Symmetry: D2
Subunit: 31 residues, 4 copies
């Protein structure tokens, strides 16, 4: 159960990085 | 039509936020078990 | 525990739809 | 520089696949409990 929790924390951080990459792309596309 | 892509990326960014929140809420429910 | 499982199925489907949207965007950008 | 955006979107698409797989693997571990 802890291995699931740790893995969820890791997925959240990966999702946050993708989120920053997509916002940078959007920024670039608008300029 | 580039404007449409940017609009869509904003929609995806928001949809991803919602997924992070739901995933965070699951992480918390498991740390209560 | 089942409510978590059902919610994970739902998140997977949402992630799949985003995946199709990003591939359509990539397709459009390349053309 | 549009080529760089497309390359990056491919990288994100792949990174998202990996997340779906890890999430699917969690869903399965919970259905075993």
């Amino acid at each position: 159960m802890k291995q699931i929790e740790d893995k969820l924390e890791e997925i959240l951080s990966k999702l946050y990085h993708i989120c920053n990459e997509l916002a940078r792309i959007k920024k670039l596309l608008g300029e």
